[model samples]
Target: GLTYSQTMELKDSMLQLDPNAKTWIDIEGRPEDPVEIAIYQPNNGQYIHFYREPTDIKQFKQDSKHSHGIDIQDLFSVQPGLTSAVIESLPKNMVLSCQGADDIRKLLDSQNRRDIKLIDVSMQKDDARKFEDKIWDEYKHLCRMHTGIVTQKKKRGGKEEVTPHCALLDCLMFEAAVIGSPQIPTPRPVLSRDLVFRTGPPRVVL
Candidate 1:
């Protein structure tokens, strides 16, 4: 029979922290039409670096320039847009780099593919208080002050203007914080610690 060790481990919410996996993925946009993705790869346990791959979208190119003044920093010259079974082909235990875990589930249901489990690293960070305090410090370089709006600027067509935020760097930092923080195992509540049982204040009239 297992002892307290097993019980303690079981008390924690199931998190997708895979030491064996060595790498984890974070994504932007819907699986139906993925905009971009970043994968953080650990190197000899000393450092981690990320590589960003863009999903081919003609509209993204046009809109990025016209609307956001973003210039595509293409890692590769060409790649097919992420869609359908391509999402199914992603690595298991993926971290939905942003909020909207429900949207990811919806996408998965559309594909009718099982075996994929998404880790809400956002919730994990909330519990850790790690990224919660560092948002301004970590993201301020690429975002606007006070609003936290992504207004990262770049020179586009010889004019300095706002562009898409550096998702590659952003996702990398997010993954780093998640992996660096010690896993916070949730405690099991077998009984209420601060509760008092009373018979309606001894039947006193209000």
Candidate 2:
């Protein structure tokens, strides 16, 4: 089992996007100790974020950053981290902000914590074609980039072994999803596409 400090350290195969900072964030995760965790701010509301990569075992990998020479951005889930029981622990003013596959959200929302102010986050993909562009653009200054290899044993082409994993990517996505939970999302313009008739004389097409 690699230490958190070790896990935070990217191997030669891994890449460091930025340096670490001091943010008294208490990280918690499932599979408990020696497992990946999401950083949380206890003094900052009932906010909690964690990463759950349940696909590494089924994916292929290699050495030197994705031995498969492939890259993935979506690899974390707050599933096991935020349970209904957990949400229930919070007050009615509870704010549940999560970002991940719809199934995960569906699972969380299914709790019918509708009683609580539930909100969803949208990651805008404007040309960058990467989720990081949206998340980092918003929370970059508050956190650091730490990529680590999938230390777990898994199948890659055939044999099972540890390979590089981009969990930081997932962490960022989770951040974007919840970062705006405390506030309201502005309404995007809704387009109504019905032009006036060609023969209309300054009259609307009814």
Candidate 3:
């Protein structure tokens, strides 16, 4: 993923582009000229597959138009949401994944959204990490870093390629982890219920 500063540059370049040019699909990685962007969609049946991109928010301070002085509140949101009519526009699914369960409960309280479930996940420090790590291994290509800035990877035969820090790559890593994640077994006690536990033992049985 492009780092924060790079993403800011991307948003800037995107804003500068012909506003009518809807270029969200098919592209290479980050252009050296910071204002350029890399974009592509990947097939990720597992997680809700997506490649995050920055866009010019339509309703912002006119003076700040196409400038870096953009306001967060003014940005456009989706196939995403500002809510309601958006909910109706969405595809039917039992569960959604993203943070804010308490917030989503507000959706459930709404007139037409009482039946959906949501999954909250992270790339670090949780069971989700297990899933993330597993998939990261399987789809290592997606775990990319941009060339240069000097890094070493002995397993890759030392000194990584100075090509692209790239991929349709990032999305599937999440999908590989998520959709099938529902099917992944949670930690169960190795102990068996039907196996009788007694050599006259409460906690001590073979």
Candidate 4:
């Protein structure tokens, strides 16, 4: 995790790299260096995951070309939209089930609600199975999507060292959403055993 000063320093470095780059701001826990920031450049057919720990929107503006068009929001809120978009963009055979009532209810209970709604879960057996399949498929897709950042090998003095790319962008997004809106507790009744059973079960006499 980065301290406030570290974040600022990283942001400064990113700005120096690409003066014309676009910026997207996401507030999250202090992240380490080389965070994975996703970028979709339709014009260049470049769907890249950049690595940097940028502090503010200003640095993003300097490091990215799509900064002007990028939508900057909390990761939690954006995750659902991103998930839906990705799923919709896939082939018909790859389409997954949508979130269910119980799933939504559980999400409402948890503090982490960012992409929870995007999870395809249901109470119905068929729907649940379909959702599980889709979820697994999506997991594979995510691994593929992030391959650019995670796959790498280096040779150092006859010893091989592999350092995968970072994923702070997604981490930050999730943290921000969870921290921003916490779930409130619901009212419930408290039962007292003393009133119902003072001792053991009552015996029935013939």
lDDT of 2 by residue, 1-206 (tens): 23333333312112211112111112222222212333222222122333333334433223214322222333321223323333333344444333333433344356655554433444452211234455445544432323434333334444443322223334444443444432323211111111100122365779
Ranked candidates, highest TM-score first: 1, 2, 3, 4
Could you tell which candidate, 1 or 3, scores higher by lDDT? Answer: 1
For 148-189, candidate 1 gives per-residue lDDT tens digits of: 223333445444433233333444455546567423222122
Residue-level lDDT of model 4, residues 1-206, one tens digit each, is 33454344334432332212221122111222112333221112222222223346564433232211122331112111222222122222221122233432242224333332333333343322323332333333332222221222233344322222222222222222333421212211111222111245468887
Candidate with maximal lDDT: 1
Steric collisions counted per model: 0, 2, 3, 10
Go through the candidates in order and give each one's C-alpha lDDT: 0.39, 0.31, 0.31, 0.27
The count of backbone overlaps in candidate 4 is: 10
Residue runs of model 1 more than 4 Å from their true location after superposition: 1-23, 41-76, 81-100, 123-167, 179-206
Of 2 and 4, which scores higher on TM-score? 2
Which prediction has more favorable lDDT, 1 or 4?
1
| Comparison by TM-score, 2 against 3, better one | 2
